[PDB]
Design a protein around this nucleic acid. Structure first.
Ligand code: MG
Ligand code: MG
Ligand code: MG
Ligand code: MG
Ligand code: MG
Ligand code: MG
Lengths: 50, 120, 241
RNA sequence: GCCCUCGGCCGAUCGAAAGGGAGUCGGGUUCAGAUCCCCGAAUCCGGAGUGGCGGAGAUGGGCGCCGCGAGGCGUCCAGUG
RNA sequence: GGGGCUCUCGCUUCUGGCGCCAAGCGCCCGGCCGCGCGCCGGCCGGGCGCGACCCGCUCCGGGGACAGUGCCAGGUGGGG
């Protein structure tokens, strides 16, 4: 509410403890549910990657 | 070679807490219980409604201390009248006095108890 | 040969995104309490900043051999404890009632302690060796002592531990101690100490006066400066020759 | 009691008789009270250390046997439906 | 062969799965029976190290003697 952009709820793995992390990214146009996004230096050039 | 920090947070270490071992009591003697049984049971109610409760519901109606709960009223009635009671209902009157309806156990007759108390 | 076939290795790899990281040592990356951070940062600041020579001279102290041998000499001259004083006072009272009289009986040489006592002894030139702790926290109690001892000619040294000097004088912490006259059997040991102390402290007082401290950068800064220097050096080397 | 290991509601506390929030209904009864009293039917939560009773787990299979046989005996093997 | 020399001193991209509380190895300390010659046989437990490299002085990064703050000075200032 109050924002024109959709928000993407994205679930990662905590690399240090057994848990699932939930982030609230700003949805880039094209991404869909069930899609894998990759965040990091070695990530590739795809829509939604960071 | 074994002191390790697997967490990046420093928490306050758990120290020893002693229990109080005072060198003198702050109160010389414990103050006695003012809300004893005679304080709890002030006087019975002798109105038309109270009499009808005695002769119908096996219930004695009392005016009790406003600070006494149902357990205290039950135990006080049991001790200072030598009767067994089933349940206690309690209201506070519009004048501020607490009223207790004490139903007696089936083997006790509230009429006879009221006669021994002297409130018939 | 007889090992159970059901036993097998189950190696886990700790690459990125794979099996979660093991519980490893994280002391370097701990959110420490403010007081721990403050004392460590103060230790770092005393290495960053240009420390004046009058404060920097206390970082030069005795080595293990000389400090231990000096403390061994000084252990023979510890001040008497309260129990020892009360017992010699009782013995003195009984023997005085017996007929011993005053009889000063050569009050034994003792170790004088305390900065005011020691500085008065130094001013009167009644001190034969001064030992100064290196870690007096309000360090103005001692900054004048090396220069004063040099001017008066009394040999002085700096030792590691106001706590060690305190244990020498049966207290928690002593700033400085002084050797007044010493016993005949210990005169040789005191002279042997005083000569090395004199060479290491009073003789080189002129360069102690000028030896500034600190002014050293952190390991990261030093390393990156070194790698920049090496880059320019290697390109210059390929240029030359 | 101490030690080892684990332990972020990461923020006290307050804030709704219309929000969220387990589980009570029928009949009778007073001058004035009743889903609260009486009668009769339920129900939720909490407790039970010495364990309250049952039922479930859990009571089978093989082989040597005894025994007219059934049924019992003994060595093994299973058994968190 | 192989070192001064380099990117690596990396382990995860076709799936709307799973993933923690160490397997393995090595060194020990107990209790048990016992060849009854000790590194000596087997059984019930516990500890440590490597697995999971070493050292280091700022947690990591971005600014930085500027910004900012304190005091004075000039300007602007119907916002009051
Ligand atoms: Mg009530
Ligand atoms: Mg917390
Ligand atoms: Mg509240
Ligand atoms: Mg409500
Ligand atoms: Mg009404
Ligand atoms: Mg005006």
């Amino acid at each position: 509410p109050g924002r024109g952009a959709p928000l993407a709820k994205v679930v990662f793995r905590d690399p240090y403890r057994f848990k699932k992390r939930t982030e609230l990214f700003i949805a880039a146009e094209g991404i869909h549910t069930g899609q894998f996004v990759y965040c990091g230096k070695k990530a590739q050039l795809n829509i939604g990657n960071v | 070679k074994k002191k390790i920090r697997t967490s990046p947070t420093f928490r306050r270490p758990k120290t020893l807490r002693l229990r109080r071992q005072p060198k003198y009591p702050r109160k010389s003697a414990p103050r006695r219980n003012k809300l004893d049984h005679y304080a709890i049971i002030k006087f019975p109610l002798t109105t038309e409604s109270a009499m009808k409760k005695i002769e119908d519901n096996n219930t004695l109606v009392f005016i009790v201390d406003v600070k006494a709960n149902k357990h205290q009223i039950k135990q006080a009635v049991k001790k200072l009248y030598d009767i067994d009671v089933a349940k206690v209902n309690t209201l506070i009157r519009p004048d501020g006095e607490k009223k207790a309806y004490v139903r007696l156990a089936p083997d006790y007759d509230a009429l006879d108890v009221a006669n021994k108390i002297g409130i018939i | 040969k007889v090992v159970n076939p059901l036993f097998e290795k189950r190696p886990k790899n700790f690459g990125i995104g794979q099996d979660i990281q093991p519980k490893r040592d994280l002391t370097r990356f701990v959110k420490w309490p403010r007081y721990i951070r403050l004392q460590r940062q103060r230790a770092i600041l005393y290495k960053r900043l240009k420390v004046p020579p009058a404060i920097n001279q206390f970082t030069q102290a005795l080595d293990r051999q000389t400090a231990t041998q000096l403390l061994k000499l000084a252990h023979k001259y510890r001040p008497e404890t309260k129990q020892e004083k009360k017992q010699r006072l009782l013995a003195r009272a009984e023997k005085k009632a017996a007929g011993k009289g005053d009889v000063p009986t050569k009050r034994p040489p003792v170790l004088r302690a305390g900065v005011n006592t020691v500085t008065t002894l130094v001013e009167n030139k009644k001190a034969q060796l001064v030992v100064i702790a290196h870690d007096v926290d309000p360090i103005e109690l001692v900054v004048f002592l090396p220069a004063l001892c040099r001017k008066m000619g009394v040999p002085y040294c700096i030792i590691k531990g106001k706590a060690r000097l305190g244990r020498l004088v049966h207290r928690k912490t002593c700033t400085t101690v002084a050797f007044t006259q010493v016993n005949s059997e210990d005169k040789g040991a005191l002279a042997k100490l005083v000569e090395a102390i004199r060479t290491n402290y009073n003789d080189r007082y002129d360069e102690i006066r000028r030896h500034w401290g600190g002014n050293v950068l952190g390991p990261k800064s030093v390393a990156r400066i070194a790698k920049l220097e090496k880059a320019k050096a290697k390109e210059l080397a390929t240029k030359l020759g």
